[PDB]
Design an enzyme around this catalytic site. Sequence first.
Site, PDB file in Angstrom:
ATOM      1  N   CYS A 185       3.263   1.612   9.884  1.00 32.19           N
ATOM      2  CA  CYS A 185       3.301   0.664   8.737  1.00 32.19           C
ATOM      3  C   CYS A 185       4.743   0.568   8.256  1.00 32.19           C
ATOM      4  O   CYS A 185       5.452   1.605   8.161  1.00 32.19           O
ATOM      5  CB  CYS A 185       2.293   0.995   7.641  1.00 32.19           C
ATOM      6  SG  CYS A 185       0.608   0.587   8.196  1.00 32.19           S
TER       7      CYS A 185
ATOM      8  N   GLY B 204       1.318   5.595  11.080  1.00 27.96           N
ATOM      9  CA  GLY B 204       2.750   5.902  11.232  1.00 27.96           C
ATOM     10  C   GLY B 204       3.602   4.660  11.481  1.00 27.96           C
ATOM     11  O   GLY B 204       4.833   4.782  11.332  1.00 27.96           O
TER      12      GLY B 204
ATOM     13  N   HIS C   1       0.830  -1.237   0.000  1.00 32.91           N
ATOM     14  CA  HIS C   1       0.000   0.000   0.000  1.00 32.91           C
ATOM     15  C   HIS C   1       0.858   1.279   0.000  1.00 32.91           C
ATOM     16  O   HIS C   1       0.288   2.380  -0.152  1.00 32.91           O
ATOM     17  CB  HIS C   1      -1.010  -0.011   1.125  1.00 32.91           C
ATOM     18  CG  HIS C   1      -0.467   0.129   2.505  1.00 32.91           C
ATOM     19  ND1 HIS C   1      -0.450  -0.948   3.374  1.00 32.91           N
ATOM     20  CD2 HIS C   1      -0.091   1.213   3.224  1.00 32.91           C
ATOM     21  CE1 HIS C   1       0.010  -0.543   4.552  1.00 32.91           C
ATOM     22  NE2 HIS C   1       0.246   0.774   4.480  1.00 32.91           N
TER      23      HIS C   1
ATOM     24  N   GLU D  25       0.802  -8.408   0.637  1.00 30.82           N
ATOM     25  CA  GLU D  25       0.989  -7.019   1.157  1.00 30.82           C
ATOM     26  C   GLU D  25       2.470  -6.701   1.327  1.00 30.82           C
ATOM     27  O   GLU D  25       2.766  -5.648   1.908  1.00 30.82           O
ATOM     28  CB  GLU D  25       0.195  -6.842   2.452  1.00 30.82           C
ATOM     29  CG  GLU D  25      -0.046  -5.378   2.833  1.00 30.82           C
ATOM     30  CD  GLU D  25      -0.645  -4.476   1.761  1.00 30.82           C
ATOM     31  OE1 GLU D  25      -1.334  -4.992   0.837  1.00 30.82           O
ATOM     32  OE2 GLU D  25      -0.384  -3.250   1.825  1.00 30.82           O
TER      33      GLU D  25
END
Length: 182
Positions: free
Chosen positions: A148, A146, A41, A72
């Site tokens: 990730c 914040g 992402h 991911e």
Amino acid sequence: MGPGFDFAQAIMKKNTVIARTEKGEFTMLGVYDRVAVIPTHASVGEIIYINDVETRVLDACALRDLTDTNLEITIVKLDRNQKFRDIRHFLPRCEDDYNDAVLSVHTSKFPNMYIPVGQVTNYGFLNLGGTPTHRILMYNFPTRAGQCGGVVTTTGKVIGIHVGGNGAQGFAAMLLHSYFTD
């Protein structure tokens, strides 16, 4: 404060950079040579900022499992003038549950941050922001925007990168040794 935080700090001090994309600032884990990981992402493009230095992306691959389900994890090769310490021998070979993990973050917003998250469940399937996702690890800590890309470690193992939360739980994508065979 203890041997868990000791291993986490050793990884942060040598194997992390601050990555900035158009989607924000992320902790980024360098694995070996010029190869790093980041949550998918983050939407890595042709150019990324690494510690506020304009850097060409030589390759970027959003990983999916053999059922063609999102993992991911994006593997990035950076046009950087320096290699990472090779930490592939700290990666698990198989999907597993863990005790006593630390989530470590280093950004402009959260410098030198370490969170003891406790027990880590092999959760498996998660609908992450609407996207079916496999190989998810879960921990019972109220993680926030914040964090990730934060690195999840136990003593002696680098097991995942933080990719989301629901306010009560946090979720990480597994790192497996097999992602980084050259």
